[PDB]
Design an enzyme around this catalytic site. Structure first.
Site, PDB file in Angstrom:
ATOM      1  CG  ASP A  81       9.771  23.735  -8.951  1.00 18.51           C
ATOM      2  OD1 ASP A  81      10.740  23.573  -8.191  1.00 18.51           O
ATOM      3  OD2 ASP A  81       9.811  23.515 -10.171  1.00 18.51           O
ATOM      4  CB  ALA A  82       3.940  23.293  -4.866  1.00 18.72           C
TER       5      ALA A  82
END
Ligand SMILES: [Zn+2]
Ligand SMILES: [Zn+2]
Ligand SMILES: [Zn+2]
Lengths: 1097, 67, 40, 125, 142
Positions: A732-733
């Site tokens: 999710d970065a």
């Protein structure tokens, strides 16, 4: 020109004259125009017990206007009441009829307190302001209104929902607790609540004003029904299965030898509590317990106990049907069983009790002059009104501001009635409206009120709910809804006899369960022979508008009933009537609706559309589209995307996503930051996150056209290459561009208010603002660099981590107590506001501005529930590039798509890409929007690929990438969760004075709790000196002096319980264990430490 | 609140093409996508700078002290 | 087990009551325990 | 289907109201309580049918008519408004008689007759 | 007045298992004052004669000593006594230059009232204004 896809224009026609905050605005308009009279008339007269001639009665009431004035009073505008921390209110002019001397006198326009009025209601000055008067009064015309300004803080009264009040609800479980509530509530004439329980196969009657519960045959005999065959015909009928279940209850009446109504009433006359005042007999009490004590909305007035006996008989028929079949129970969570209590209903509960307590405290002071001397010296009785009129004002203001709900007369102690309005977004201010609270937030269950019901189709939003501790207990209302207005029912009752019911006092109790009986609000009224002819002729009187709309009739069949509800707090929803397989709204009506004439509510009067209750949707069969209309249909959807509310309309293509994803967006659209208002630079608020260059979405929705979201948007269109890159975007970065941030991509701004009040004291000495403190010549010292000559910091100057921007001094000595900017980053003073509040003391508000850009660790999100953090910022010659040279602003990992199944994000990119190449904004509205097969027509028209996948080169190595990269514009929004406001760290600092451990919270120096679950983790590693160090040595270590013969702790190497310093040992101990022992010695137990040596001999 | 000076993804200067974008739409009217191409915004990163630009400086300037 | 001189059963009736240290009940505003001791 | 079932039962009650009205003729002192709406049209001036439709007593006589249609049905019209009719109370089980009260000094409870059944008339909304 | 109503709203409350009811009042309606206070006692409690106990225990103590423990009992009842009260009763009565009295006999007339715990009754005679305040606190139990 007009067709099936044009009936959605009723939705701008509905929301035009209604709006979305009408459930706050109409309720408050009902209160100040109808319910103020029905409170004054409920207690009009003041009776002086000393000299019963000096009466006092209130003729009428009105707020905000004197009767002699032809104009409304001047109010301080709502924005000035935000700045000066006042309460936006209006004077309550009552006028009074009283006695003075030897004649009666009317006095006009007595001000009894002040009423805090709601914004955009009738008495608000923003009502019909033409957007150039909004600018003069510094108000945003896109603000919803519907809230109160109380002490500067703007407060919203949330929509409460209760269970349905005056109706019957059947519960059951194993161990046979079949209970039947009926929470009776006539306003507070009585507020009562009966039960009906089966114990041991025997039906009883519990009530909280009875000592011990009464069986059921000797309470129908307490009413008129005493023939004891008709009791077997009111609760059983001819059903032989039910006659066995009730037959135990018959012989119990003979077992107590109860046979007449005289003897039946005398049974319960000796079972009551609260015998107080009259010393009347048990006959006079037992005939009063049926009068206004058990089922209090059915007050009897005469000898005829018939319809109330028929009420308790139809309660206990639903018990016997529940004993036979255990599945004939009522859902407590069904939306038809709910009532929505709005803000006018709550304030009418609140303003009444303060007007009770006004009149009580005015009566016990109107006799404190009568029974005292100067008898011949009369008094006007209108000089003690202002003694208590500051309790009307202060009790209205406190209950809205605190949110506490302390009603002594009504006996309710609700908490959390109000909330501070959210000013995080434009969406937060509109999502805090349309929000519904619930009663379940005190006791816990599993899988009950937290699961959404299929009965909220179109009534409540099916995705806008928080995630976590309140998932399914906070809920949100949809677009095309309406809350019903409570209206009179005895005109509706008298219409029922004309239409063909025959009265309950006319019908035989034997043949009552052979015909459908009508139920005006749960109360049995009559018995129709032909029900579907009766129901059809009652809709027809409603569609012609003779009887009102929001009056719902539905013909149940298993209950064999015809219910007619007319009370308020039901949720309606407009639908198009169809008849004989054909939608009644033809294309001539849509042609008229477009070009100005024949608005919504002309579709109601001309019989075209119709409000449906949740219950009336049982007696219906609703088409979704015009192509689906079969002849057995009876309604048609105006527009299917109104299944979602105001916040869930921000999502592009919600029907392509997975459903948990569309719920995370609703929580995160309220958290994303952008533009707030048009006076957002004229307001001084506590914390205000703004965006420098907000953009409207490329892919938009009809639902955000309607709520005017694209005029105050919160987000920017990022160029997004969906690819895996750098290994810093793993879970999710997201990979970010450096040259985008340098140009203003995602760059935000924080604003914070700081209020000091220079209070004057009772010693006639006042707080003072200090002066600039120079040194060695005319230049300031470090803490006064940003100060200026009058002690209040200069506008535009940079304050940083230690300087002073308000130099105030308390007391003639002056103890210097200035404010000190303690922030980790500097911040420029942008607004210093010098004013005086209501009680004539100074009020300085200083606003502080801070610019901030995307760091590693800020949260961005798309509008598809995919929250993400910034993992790396990349130099823009390292980003991949196409043939035209475009580089992404964000790179997003392909691994957030398959597990989360957000296919509607894969269509936002193409519709976003094809729309910007065409020059048109596209639509991703629910159950519709732009189509993928002709967004891919525009996209080949240019020379791009149809699928949105481009051949990007590599910025690092120059080569073609071996995959085609899905590449185009997604609308990203930046959230308020920023790593500058989250990174904190503590070595040593302040300690709590009791436990002498490091303090709590983040906004202290800090202290991170290591608690009860990581202790478990390091025991499992066996690390024993870490556990000694991390819990005692570096949390609370305490050198203590124990005694060896006593085991108690002495001071200074000296024991007290044996006066000797002889065998005192010095040990290190947790201070919480020291605090434990000295709390045990005070409870008179003695923990005596037994010590020993560590070392073998 | 006011137009960005440069496109975010290229750095192509687009701040001088907002005053001229509104004249191509208001007089001699165009369909918002050939008014972009006439200003010379080929790349879609640069078209989205002024197409989805909402101009809030005009509304913010209504609420100043009249001065 | 009344070998200890505080063993005796009448030590469980409040004849004397220890006043706790002010470290146990501070004053930030009197404490809840400090206002209870004075009432006693 | 249910609106068709109530149609034929009303059609069954229309022959059943015609027998019980014709058989009841000239059997002396044998009544039938039957239900009219509370408000009636005016008769000093004739309120027209759609005007009485909207807002929803001393009288002389010959105020209406019980018309027998050729097909199978009946319909009371009074004045000029047209109502519909059905034996619509219930098959009553409790036994019914009519008693006249006298006010003060000729104090008597005259027993007039016995109720056959109960038919209802509704305005034709 | 309003401020007198505020300081009477101070002195009437109830905690967990105690109920204190007392107030202050000021009105103009040492040999002659012995009857001037028993009428205040009769009007204050119209069910007990106060012409009986004529040589009573009027402890003519210092008003500073009286307001000391009058403030200490409000600390002792969890009230945090608000100081402006003592200016308000000053502002009507000129609290500085006046003498204080206190009806505290051996056995007061409330010992027979069930639920009685303790009292604090203050008289504040004024000479130039004739303004006697009857400050009384009756702690009961319910
Ligand atoms: Zn010792
Ligand atoms: Zn730029
Ligand atoms: Zn560009």
């Amino acid at each position: 020109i007009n067709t099936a896809q044009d009936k959605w224009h009723l939705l701008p026609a509905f929301l035009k004259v209604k709006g979305l905050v009408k459930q706050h605005l109409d309720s408050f308009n009902y209160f100040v125009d109808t319910d103020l009279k029905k409170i004054i008339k409920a207690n009009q007269l003041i009776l002086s017990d000393v000299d019963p001639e000096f009466y006092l009665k209130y003729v009428d009431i009105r707020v905000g206007k004197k009767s002699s004035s032809s104009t409304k009073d001047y109010l301080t505008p709502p924005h000035e009441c935000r700045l000066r921390d006042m309460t936006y209110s209006a004077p309550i002019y009552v006028d009074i009829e009283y006695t003075r001397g030897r004649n009666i006198i009317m006095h006009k326009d007595v001000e009894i307190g002040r009423m805090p009025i709601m914004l955009r209601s009738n008495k608000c000055i923003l009502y019909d302001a033409d957007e150039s008067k909004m600018a003069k009064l510094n108000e945003c015309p896109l603000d919803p209104g519907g809230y109160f300004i109380v002490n500067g803080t703007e407060k919203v009264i949330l929509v409460q929902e209760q269970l349905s009040k005056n109706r019957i609800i059947v519960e059951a479980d194993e161990k046979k607790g079949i209970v039947q509530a009926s929470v009776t509530s006539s306003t507070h004439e009585r507020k009562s609540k009966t039960y009906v329980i089966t114990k041991n196969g025997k039906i009883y009657l519990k009530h909280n004003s009875i000592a011990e519960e009464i069986p059921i045959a000797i309470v129908l005999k307490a009413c008129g029904i005493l023939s004891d065959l008709e009791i077997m015909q009111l609760v059983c009928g001819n059903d032989s299965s039910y006659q066995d279940i009730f037959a135990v209850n018959l012989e119990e009446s003979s077992k107590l030898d109860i046979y007449t109504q005289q003897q039946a009433l005398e049974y319960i006359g000796a079972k009551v509590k609260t015998m107080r005042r009259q010393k009347l007999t048990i006959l006079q009490e037992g005939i009063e317990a049926i009068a206004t004590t058990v089922i209090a909305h059915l007050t009897v007035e005469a000898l005829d106990f018939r319809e109330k006996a028929l009420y308790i008989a139809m309660m206990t028929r639903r018990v016997v049907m529940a004993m036979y079949n255990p599945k004939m129970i009522d859902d407590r969570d069904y939306v038809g069983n709910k009532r929505l209590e709005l803000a006018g209903q709550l304030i009418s509960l609140l303003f009444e009790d303060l007007f009770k307590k006004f009149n009580n405290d005015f009566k016990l002071s109107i006799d404190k002059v009568l029974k005292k001397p100067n008898r011949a010296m009369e008094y006007d009785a209108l000089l003690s009104i202002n003694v208590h009129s500051n309790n009307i004002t202060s009790g209205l203001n406190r209950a809205i501001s605190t949110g506490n709900w302390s009603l002594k007369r009504f006996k309710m102690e609700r908490a959390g009635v109000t909330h501070v309005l959210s000013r995080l977004s434009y969406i937060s201010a509109l999502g805090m409206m349309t929000r519904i609270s619930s009663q379940f937030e005190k006791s816990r269950k599993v899988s009950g009120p937290r699961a959404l019901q299929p009965s909220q189709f179109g009534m409540l939003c099916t995705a806008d709910t928080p995630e976590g501790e309140a998932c399914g207990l906070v809920k949100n209302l949809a677009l095309m809804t309406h809350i019903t207005t409570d209206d009179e029912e005895e005109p509706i009752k008298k219409l029922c006899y004309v239409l063909g019911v025959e009265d309950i006092t006319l019908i035989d109790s034997a043949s009552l369960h052979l015909n459908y009986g009508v139920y005006l609000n749960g109360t049995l009224i009559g018995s129709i022979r032909f029900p579907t002819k009766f129901v059809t002729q009652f809709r027809h009187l409603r569609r012609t508008g003779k009887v009102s709309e929001f009056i719902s009739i539905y013909s149940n069949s298993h209950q064999m009933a015809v219910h007619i509800a007319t009370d308020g707090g039901r949720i309606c929803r407009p639908l198009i009537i169809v008849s004989d397989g054909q939608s009644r709204v033809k294309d001539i009506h849509l042609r008229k609706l477009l070009d100005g004439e024949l608005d919504f509510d002309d579709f109601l009067k001309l019989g075209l559309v119709e409000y449906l209750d949740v219950n009336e949707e049982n007696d219906s069969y609703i088409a979704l589209y015009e192509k689906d209309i079969v002849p057995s249909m009876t309604h048609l959807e105006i527009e299917p995307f109104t299944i979602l509310g105001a916040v869930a309309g921000l999502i592009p293509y919600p029907h392509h996503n997975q459903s948990p994803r569309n719920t995370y967006q609703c929580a995160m659209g309220k958290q994303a930051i952008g533009a707030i208002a048009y006076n957002q630079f004229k307001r001084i608020d506590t914390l205000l996150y703004l965006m420098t260059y907000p953009q409207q979405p490329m892919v938009k929705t009809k639902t955000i056209e309607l709520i005017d979201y694209d005029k105050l948007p919160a987000g920017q269109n990022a160029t997004v290459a969906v690819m895996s890159y750098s290994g810093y975007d793993i879970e999710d970065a997201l990979v970010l561009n450096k040259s985008s941030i340098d140009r203003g991509f995602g760059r935000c701004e924080t604003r914070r208010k700081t209020t000091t009040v220079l209070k004057r004291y009772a010693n006639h000495t006042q707080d003072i603002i200090g002066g600039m403190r120079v040194d060695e010549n005319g230049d300031p010292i470090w803490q006064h660099q940003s100060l200026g000559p009058d002690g209040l910091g200069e506008v535009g100057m940079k304050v940083q981590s230690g300087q002073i921007y308000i130099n105030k001094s308390v007391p003639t000595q002056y103890r210097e107590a200035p404010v000190i900017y303690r922030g980790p980053e500097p911040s420029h003073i942008d607004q210093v506001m010098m004013s005086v509040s209501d009680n004539d003391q100074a009020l300085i508000k200083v606003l502080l501005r801070q610019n901030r850009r995307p760091e590693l660790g800020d949260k961005f999100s798309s509008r598809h529930g995919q929250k993400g953090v910034c993992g790396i910022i990349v130099k823009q010659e390292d980003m991949p590039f196409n043939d035209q040279g475009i580089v992404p602003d964000i790179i997003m990992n392909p691994h957030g798509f398959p597990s989360r199944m957000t296919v509607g994000k894969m269509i936002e990119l193409i519709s976003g890409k094809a729309g910007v190449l065409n020059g048109t904004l596209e639509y991703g509205t629910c159950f519709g929007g732009s189509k993928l097969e002709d967004m891919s027509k525009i996209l080949v028209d240019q020379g791009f690929n149809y699928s949105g996948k481009d051949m990007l080169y590599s910025g690092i190595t120059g080569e073609c990438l071996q995959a085609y990269i899905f590449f185009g514009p997604i609308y990203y929004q930046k959230l308020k969760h920023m790593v500058l406001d989250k990174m904190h760290a503590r070595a040593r600092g302040p300690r709590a004075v009791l436990t002498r451990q490091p303090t709590e919270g983040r906004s202290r120096d800090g202290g991170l709790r290591l608690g009860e679950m990581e202790r478990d983790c390091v025991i499992a590693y066996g690390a024993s000196q870490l556990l000694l160090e991390r819990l005692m040595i570096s949390s609370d270590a305490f050198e203590v002096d124990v005694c060896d013969k006593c085991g108690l702790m002495g001071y200074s190497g000296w024991c007290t319980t044996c006066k000797s310093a002889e065998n005192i040992i010095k040990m290190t101990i947790p201070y919480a264990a020291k605090l434990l022992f000295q709390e045990l010695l005070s409870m008179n137990i003695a923990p005596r430490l037994r010590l020993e040596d560590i070392f073998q001999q | 609140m006011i137009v960005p000076v440069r496109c975010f993804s290229c750095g192509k200067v687009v701040g001088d093409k907002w005053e001229s974008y509104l004249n191509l739409l208001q007089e001699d009217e165009l369909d918002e996508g050939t008014a972009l191409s006439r200003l010379g915004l080929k790349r879609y990163c640069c078209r989205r700078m002024i197409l989805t630009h909402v101009d809030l400086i005009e509304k913010f300037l209504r609420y100043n002290p009249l001065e | 087990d009344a070998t200890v001189p505080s063993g005796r059963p009448e030590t469980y009736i409040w004849r004397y009551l220890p006043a706790p240290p002010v470290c146990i009940r501070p004053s930030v505003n009197e404490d809840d325990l400090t206002v209870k001791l004075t009432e006693i | 289907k249910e609106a068709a079932a109530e149609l034929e039962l009303l059609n069954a009650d229309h022959q059943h109201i015609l027998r019980k009205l014709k058989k009841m003729n000239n059997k002396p002192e044998r009544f039938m309580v039957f239900q009219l709406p509370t408000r009636l049209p005016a008769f000093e001036r004739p309120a027209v049918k759609e005007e009485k439709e909207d807002m929803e007593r001393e009288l002389a006589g010959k105020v209406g008519s019980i018309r027998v249609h050729k097909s199978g049905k009946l319909s009371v019209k009074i004045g000029n408004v047209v109502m519909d009719i059905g034996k619509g109370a219930e098959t009553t089980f409790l036994q019914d008689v009519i008693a006249l009260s006298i006010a003060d000094d000729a104090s008597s409870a005259e027993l007039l007759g016995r109720v056959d059944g109960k038919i209802v008339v509704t305005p034709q909304i | 007045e309003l401020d007198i109503e505020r300081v009477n709203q101070t002195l009437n409350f109830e905690t967990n298992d105690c109920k204190i009811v007392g107030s202050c009042d000021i009105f103009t309606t040492s040999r002659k004052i012995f009857a001037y206070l028993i009428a205040i006692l009769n009007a204050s409690y119209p069910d007990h004669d106060f012409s009986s106990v004529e040589p009573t225990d009027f402890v003519k103590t210092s008003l500073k000593t009286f307001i000391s423990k009058f403030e200490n009992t409000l600390y002792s009842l969890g009230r945090q006594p608000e100081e402006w009260v003592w200016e308000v009763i000053n502002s009507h009565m000129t609290l500085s230059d006046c003498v204080l009295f206190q009806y505290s006999p051996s056995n007061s007339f409330l010992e027979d009232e069930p639920g009685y715990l303790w009292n604090l009754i203050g008289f504040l005679y004024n000479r130039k204004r004739k303004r006697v305040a009857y400050l009384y606190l009756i702690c009961s139990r319910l």
